[PDB]
Design a protein around this ligand. Sequence first.
Ligand SMILES: CC(C)(COP(=O)(O)OP(=O)(O)OC[C@H]1O[C@@H](n2cnc3c(N)ncnc32)[C@H](O)[C@@H]1OP(=O)(O)O)[C@@H](O)C(=O)NCCC(=O)NCCS
Ligand SMILES: [Zn+2]
Ligand SMILES: [Zn+2]
Ligand SMILES: [Zn+2]
Ligand SMILES: [Zn+2]
Length: 534
Amino acid sequence: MGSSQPRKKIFKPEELRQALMPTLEALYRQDPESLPFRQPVDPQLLGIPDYFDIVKNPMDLSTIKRKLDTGQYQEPWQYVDDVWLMFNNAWLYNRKTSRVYKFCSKLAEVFEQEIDPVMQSLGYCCGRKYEFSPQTDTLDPEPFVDCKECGRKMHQICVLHYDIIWPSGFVCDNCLKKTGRPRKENKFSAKRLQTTRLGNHLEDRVNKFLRRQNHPEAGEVFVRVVASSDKTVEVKPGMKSRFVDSGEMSESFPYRTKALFAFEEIDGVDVCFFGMHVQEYGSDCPPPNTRRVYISYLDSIHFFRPRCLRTAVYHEILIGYLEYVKKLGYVTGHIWACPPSEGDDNIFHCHPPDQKIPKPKRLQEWYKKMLDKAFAERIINDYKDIFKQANEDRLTSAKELPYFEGDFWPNVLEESIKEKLYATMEKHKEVFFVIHLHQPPIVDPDPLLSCDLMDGRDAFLTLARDKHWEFSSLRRSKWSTLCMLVELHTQGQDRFVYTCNECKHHVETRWHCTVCEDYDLCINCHTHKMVKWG
Ligand SMILES: CC(C)(COP(=O)(O)OP(=O)(O)OC[C@H]1O[C@@H](n2cnc3c(N)ncnc32)[C@H](O)[C@@H]1OP(=O)(O)O)[C@@H](O)C(=O)NCCC(=O)NCCS
Ligand SMILES: [Zn+2]
Ligand SMILES: [Zn+2]
Ligand SMILES: [Zn+2]
Ligand SMILES: [Zn+2]
């Protein structure tokens, strides 16, 4: 099998030895940790005939030193692969408690600190071996790209390369430094996602908050509504025969759902750190859901910089949301603060293994502090839990409880008719919040964004699981954000028509304003320099 690549970087044996072997020596210097690894494992000295049935490809320091002196290593990645094979054998065969397993983890920490600067001075991304997390014996490997000039294999996630953005292929950073040419701009950014009044209100609120709270590490935050659509929730069959047939409740309740995400600039690239679905029941929706908003789902990835401000910005985003719908005319908001089930991710496909998933008491304090902040700034008038509120203006019927898609209470009520209910309600009081924000109709000024990927939380989880867009680390979150944003930019389902903001006519050729969010004067006629678009 043939392909062609003439100006490849090829390394002569001694260049490799001179560069690589200072790391193999940093492993030998580890005493006693390197001692079980200086020779090929001998199962007849150790009494473990299992071993060659479990470790199919042995490797050791000495074998690597041999290969490195013979020249058996053409590229540095083959060396790197062989030391990680050594470590992976040990980590596999021995129990996580044994001595050797821990020796290995020390050698590995040494190798990680030594091999990275070396591999980068040789013009590579790192010296790690990465594999994706297990899903549902084998693990899937991270992907590589080759520099069309070097031929040097790099980690696609390390260099953040994607052909859709850059279709003329991957070109290493240095070869571009001789090239004179810099990277051409990534146009698929979060900032360049279609703007909305809701999004603008939220990002405008957080960014002045972060400036008022000067921090050098913080980057800009972009908040984007990436989907909204009009849906209905049908009352389920038990409650169906008991109240819809009677005409006491409408058969279904219309609402608009919106999905919005926040991104922060970190190391000069977009990182998605927060995501949220909401349901908004307007002023034409029948009781009991009239003029109500509900927070369907809330998820987050803890890499916001700096850590000490992450939660405060999450609260402001939520708080900004309350400020926005209150002004548009909604009256009450509802939060179901229920923590995710064990193995279940909300929105993001692979949270960091060490991000604490909170207990419901912690989570309820969390929503409590956020709401207390909103009350203080006069955005919320006040808030109580579900039982104190139901009892406070009485209620005797199941039809007076707000009825939201996927919420707990519709399903408690469905289960109730086959085979006391106030007892079912009071047990979970603290987990369900009712928020009082405060008449003419509510009119949403934002248009509908049709986006199947974000039409509810399942499509994006599914797609990321297949494409391995994990959010398990900063580097992996950067890559998943990169690809998420390409999906939002290029496969949404919305197509855009252009109108003259002056003459109300459809425009093709037009003059577009240099400052304003979306302003296009037709040619047939504003205070800004304009350039010609479309
Ligand atoms: C709700 C959320 C956005 C708030 O995040 P947050 O402000 O960073 O705080 P959390 O409630 O996650 O945890 C904050 C602190 O408590 C700690 N903590 C959280 N859960 C813990 C647990 N199970 N045990 C011990 N400590 C815990 C964390 O380590 C963290 O400490 P730090 O400042 O040293 O890092 C986030 O937890 C999240 O995305 N939750 C997952 C899904 C969820 O909330 N459920 C569904 C919708 S509400
Ligand atoms: Zn790498
Ligand atoms: Zn190159
Ligand atoms: Zn700080
Ligand atoms: Zn015109």
